[PDB]
Scaffold this active site. Structure first.
Site, PDB file in Angstrom:
ATOM      1  N   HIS A 155       0.816  -1.203   0.000  1.00  0.00           N
ATOM      2  CA  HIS A 155       0.000   0.000   0.000  1.00  0.00           C
ATOM      3  C   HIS A 155       0.861   1.269   0.000  1.00  0.00           C
ATOM      4  O   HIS A 155       0.316   2.364  -0.176  1.00  0.00           O
ATOM      5  CB  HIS A 155      -1.057  -0.042   1.115  1.00  0.00           C
ATOM      6  CG  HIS A 155      -0.619   0.343   2.496  1.00  0.00           C
ATOM      7  ND1 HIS A 155      -0.447  -0.574   3.516  1.00  0.00           N
ATOM      8  CD2 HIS A 155      -0.426   1.557   3.053  1.00  0.00           C
ATOM      9  CE1 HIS A 155      -0.127   0.070   4.630  1.00  0.00           C
ATOM     10  NE2 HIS A 155      -0.103   1.369   4.377  1.00  0.00           N
TER      11      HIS A 155
ATOM     12  N   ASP B   6      -0.235  -7.690   1.568  1.00  0.00           N
ATOM     13  CA  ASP B   6       0.271  -6.325   1.605  1.00  0.00           C
ATOM     14  C   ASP B   6       1.798  -6.339   1.718  1.00  0.00           C
ATOM     15  O   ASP B   6       2.343  -5.992   2.769  1.00  0.00           O
ATOM     16  CB  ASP B   6      -0.403  -5.533   2.720  1.00  0.00           C
ATOM     17  CG  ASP B   6      -0.151  -4.030   2.718  1.00  0.00           C
ATOM     18  OD1 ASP B   6       0.390  -3.514   1.705  1.00  0.00           O
ATOM     19  OD2 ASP B   6      -0.499  -3.383   3.730  1.00  0.00           O
TER      20      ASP B   6
ATOM     21  N   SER C  89       3.958   1.815   8.583  1.00  0.00           N
ATOM     22  CA  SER C  89       3.727   0.713   7.653  1.00  0.00           C
ATOM     23  C   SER C  89       5.000   0.397   6.855  1.00  0.00           C
ATOM     24  O   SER C  89       5.729   1.315   6.453  1.00  0.00           O
ATOM     25  CB  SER C  89       2.558   0.997   6.728  1.00  0.00           C
ATOM     26  OG  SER C  89       1.321   1.134   7.419  1.00  0.00           O
TER      27      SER C  89
HETATM   28  C1  LIG Z   1      -7.348   4.354   4.702  1.00  0.00           C
HETATM   29  C2  LIG Z   1      -7.010   4.505   6.159  1.00  0.00           C
HETATM   30  O1  LIG Z   1      -7.042   5.597   6.725  1.00  0.00           O
HETATM   31  N1  LIG Z   1      -6.680   3.367   6.805  1.00  0.00           N
HETATM   32  C3  LIG Z   1      -6.451   3.229   8.262  1.00  0.00           C
HETATM   33  C4  LIG Z   1      -6.229   1.743   8.547  1.00  0.00           C
HETATM   34  C5  LIG Z   1      -7.707   3.696   8.990  1.00  0.00           C
HETATM   35  C6  LIG Z   1      -5.242   4.061   8.737  1.00  0.00           C
HETATM   36  C7  LIG Z   1      -3.880   3.417   8.673  1.00  0.00           C
HETATM   37  C8  LIG Z   1      -3.029   3.360   7.607  1.00  0.00           C
HETATM   38  C9  LIG Z   1      -3.224   3.907   6.213  1.00  0.00           C
HETATM   39  C10 LIG Z   1      -2.082   4.802   5.760  1.00  0.00           C
HETATM   40  C11 LIG Z   1      -1.960   6.054   5.226  1.00  0.00           C
HETATM   41  O2  LIG Z   1      -2.717   7.054   4.902  1.00  0.00           O
HETATM   42  C12 LIG Z   1      -0.449   6.009   5.043  1.00  0.00           C
HETATM   43  C13 LIG Z   1       0.338   7.021   5.911  1.00  0.00           C
HETATM   44  C14 LIG Z   1       0.037   5.936   3.580  1.00  0.00           C
HETATM   45  C15 LIG Z   1       1.379   6.105   3.250  1.00  0.00           C
HETATM   46  C16 LIG Z   1       1.801   6.022   1.930  1.00  0.00           C
HETATM   47  C17 LIG Z   1       0.902   5.754   0.901  1.00  0.00           C
HETATM   48  C18 LIG Z   1       1.355   5.675  -0.539  1.00  0.00           C
HETATM   49  C19 LIG Z   1      -0.430   5.581   1.236  1.00  0.00           C
HETATM   50  C20 LIG Z   1      -0.859   5.675   2.547  1.00  0.00           C
HETATM   51  C21 LIG Z   1      -0.629   4.591   5.657  1.00  0.00           C
HETATM   52  O3  LIG Z   1       0.141   3.682   5.921  1.00  0.00           O
HETATM   53  C22 LIG Z   1      -3.550   2.833   5.170  1.00  0.00           C
HETATM   54  C23 LIG Z   1      -3.435   1.478   5.466  1.00  0.00           C
HETATM   55  C24 LIG Z   1      -3.709   0.518   4.503  1.00  0.00           C
HETATM   56  C25 LIG Z   1      -4.101   0.896   3.234  1.00  0.00           C
HETATM   57  C26 LIG Z   1      -4.205   2.238   2.924  1.00  0.00           C
HETATM   58  C27 LIG Z   1      -3.929   3.201   3.883  1.00  0.00           C
HETATM   59  N2  LIG Z   1      -1.869   2.699   7.965  1.00  0.00           N
HETATM   60  C28 LIG Z   1      -1.972   2.319   9.296  1.00  0.00           C
HETATM   61  C29 LIG Z   1      -1.081   1.625  10.109  1.00  0.00           C
HETATM   62  C30 LIG Z   1      -1.425   1.345  11.427  1.00  0.00           C
HETATM   63  C31 LIG Z   1      -0.478   0.584  12.323  1.00  0.00           C
HETATM   64  C32 LIG Z   1      -2.661   1.788  11.906  1.00  0.00           C
HETATM   65  C33 LIG Z   1      -3.553   2.478  11.098  1.00  0.00           C
HETATM   66  C34 LIG Z   1      -3.222   2.756   9.772  1.00  0.00           C
END
Ligand SMILES: CC(=O)NC(C)(C)Cc1c([C@@H](C2=C(O)[C@](C)(c3ccc(C)cc3)C2=O)c2ccccc2)[nH]c2cc(C)ccc12
Ligand SMILES: [Zn+2]
Length: 219
Positions: free
Chosen positions: A45, A89, A175
């Protein structure tokens, strides 16, 4: 990292700081780790139009001789990554050149109930910016029933990390970073709740060893 401590500078020399460019927004950030001189493991992601990798960092606001700022030539996202369920992922980044080996930069080679450690530059609270310094925290591996509320969690593909009775946790910005159990990489930070209450969901590395070996051998 929520509820952790400042890492000893340069004590985790495999750690990577990722700055990711999207087409219609400003930079976003993730972690990662160096597994070969020209390969970094992180989360699917965290993919984008282009990515820059900084090795050798502690305080990311102050330039220093330990820094290696390295170009990425190609991104290898897992072919079964699903943006709905978040299964698979995982992603490999191939570097344009091989990194230099120094005291501050090196590889991490490959080999519920127990304690593990995770590190990153992510947010230190729901309403708090990302950390200037590398942070780390000790967390409990949980039985899979602790992550039931994540309806797409699967015990075969993922680990459930963080005692719900504590505040300690990975969060946004973290992440792609590694989970180490007795010095050995077992997981990758994936996702959790918007309010940061633990536990969180990590990718289980063992399941992907065949795929990782396949990419490395042909590139
Ligand atoms: C959509 C959504 O808000 N999802 C939740 C889960 C609520 C929030 C969440 C994410 C989320 C996320 C981003 O924004 C970010 C910074 C990113 C970075 C770089 C890029 C290129 C794209 C995104 C990233 O990472 C995410 C996670 C998974 C998929 C997409 C986004 N990661 C988490 C990790 C833990 C420990 C806790 C919660 C979360
Ligand atoms: Zn230094």
């Amino acid at each position: 990292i929520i509820g952790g401590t400042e890492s000893k500078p340069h004590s985790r020399p495999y750690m990577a700081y990722l700055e990711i460019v999207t087409s219609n927004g400003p930079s976003k950030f993730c972690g990662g780790f160096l597994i070969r001189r020209n390969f970094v493991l992180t989360a699917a992601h965290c993919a984008g139009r282009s990515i820059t990798v900084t090795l050798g960092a502690h305080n990311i606001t102050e330039e220093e001789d330990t820094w290696q700022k390295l170009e990425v030539i190609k991104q290898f996202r897992h072919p079964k990554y699903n943006t709905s369920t978040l299964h698979h992922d995982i992603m490999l980044l191939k570097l344009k050149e091989k990194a230099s080996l120094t005291l501050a930069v090196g590889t991490l080679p490959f080999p519920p109930g127990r304690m593990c450690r995770v590190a990153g530059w992510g947010r230190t609270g729901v309403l708090k910016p990302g950390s200037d310094t590398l942070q780390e925290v000790k967390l409990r591996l949980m039985d899979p029933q602790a992550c039931s509320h994540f309806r797409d969690f699967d015990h075969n593909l993922q680990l459930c990390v963080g005692n719900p009775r504590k505040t300690k946790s990975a969060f946004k910005g973290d992440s792609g970073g590694p989970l180490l159990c007795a010095g050995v990489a077992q997981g990758i930070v994936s996702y959790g709740r918007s309010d940061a209450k633990p536990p969180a969901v990590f990718t289980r590395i063992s399941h992907y060893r065949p795929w990782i070996n396949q990419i490395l051998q042909a590139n």
